[PDB]
Design a protein that fits this description.
It is built from three helices and no strands. The chain is mainly alpha-helical. The structure holds one DNA strand of 67 nucleotides. It comes from Vibrio cholerae serotype O1 (strain ATCC 39541 / Classical Ogawa 395 / O395). This is RNA polymerase sigma factor RpoD.
Length: 52
DNA sequence: TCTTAAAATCGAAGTTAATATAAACTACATAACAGACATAAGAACAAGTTACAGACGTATTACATAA
């Protein structure tokens, strides 16, 4: 789901020229916008406790 | 006995607050969420059981009155 969201947001960005808003991404995925926001916020890799 | 690569060290506070690249379909089992029922726990009312209080009634004594 994350990978194919990345690819669809890829294609939309390259076709319109700007970062696609979650509403248009949900429209292209045929999935609810709440699910799109859940996927987008799911888990970015934890930052290290030694970052200067 | 003489090179030569490694190994280790190099002042205190003070402040400081992060990022950002890069398969799909299908089949099955399991966990989670919601609803309904039964059960245990508490709230409410009413009754009964019991002794004590509060003022009354009684009993006793002393003063007054009558013979």
């Amino acid at each position: 789901t994350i990978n194919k969201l990345n690819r669809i947001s890829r294609q939309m960005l390259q076709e319109m020229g700007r970062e696609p808003l979650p509403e248009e991404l949900a429209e292209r995925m045929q999935m609810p916008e709440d699910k799109i926001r859940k996927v987008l916020k799911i888990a970015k890799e934890p930052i290290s406790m030694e970052t200067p």
